[PDB]
Swiss-Prot record, chains A, G, I:
The lineage of its organism: Eukaryota, Metazoa, Chordata, Craniata, Vertebrata. The chain holds residues 26 to 52 of 110 of the full protein. This is Insulin B chain. It comes from Homo sapiens (Human).
UniProtKB/Swiss-Prot annotation, chains C, E, K:
Transmembrane segments: none annotated. It comes from the Eukaryota. Changing residue 10 to D: In HPRI; Providence. Changing residue 22 to Q: In MODY10; reduces binding affinity to INSR; reduces biological activity; reduces folding properties. This is Insulin B chain.
Length: 27, 21, 28, 21, 28, 21, 27, 21, 27, 21, 28, 21
């Protein structure tokens, strides 16, 4: 649960930092 | 990975920039 | 370009949720 | 891509499921 | 339909906050 | 409803308070 | 606080899963 | 309820779908 | 981390409560 | 400050209104 | 006024993240 | 302000950095 909530913030942050390049997310 | 590095302490933007394409 | 920037942010929250353990990728 | 298909009309959960790994 | 989808998501975060213990309902 | 009243103009906190239980 | 942060994610998730049907949230 | 079931372990979408109207 | 996640919700909540007046956030 | 008061227990809106301009 | 309300909310999440320990201010 | 510069076109991270303390 702590992990699952933190992951939601991570992907928001990758969305921003990565820009046009985009990203992958793997738990 | 990103959960282990970044949910146990605060990653900076430069640290997060590591996981981009 | 701004409306697309805002929509993209809600897409990623939705994908995170839908895909669970499989995870996802996002290419603008 | 995801932006072209999902930011001009609403994608359902089934449709969003196409961009998972 | 998309602008309404995005706005609705911020409505619910606002309601969660405003209503506290009383809680709320959301009917699109 | 909430969408018709609050997505075409800004609802204040007092206005949002109408949709609590 | 843990409860209150988690509740914020729950309502975002209900928003998505419930669609036209909508929902109620009671803490 | 939803806080007890879903803030102590991860609810799936099918699990969350239980609390819709 | 708990602090950093909670701060993200705080600023969303200040955004809403403060309106035209706006705010400052200092960790 | 706001992290100490509001991340160890739940601040109400009136409590949060304290930190506005 | 609504599109500006929604955009502002994503601005603040972005600033929180970009500015770290320095923090920020937001004046609509 | 931030709204006029960043809600009519996309501000980069460098641009957003102008509104930190
Ligand atoms: Cl959280
Ligand atoms: Cl939005
Ligand atoms: Zn959170
Ligand atoms: Zn939004």
């Amino acid at each position: 649960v702590n992990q699952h909530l933190c992951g939601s913030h991570l992907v928001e942050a990758l969305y921003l930092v990565c820009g046009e390049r985009g990203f992958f997310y793997t738990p | 990975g990103i959960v282990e590095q970044c949910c146990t302490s605060i990653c900076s933007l430069y640290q997060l920039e590591n996981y981009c394409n």
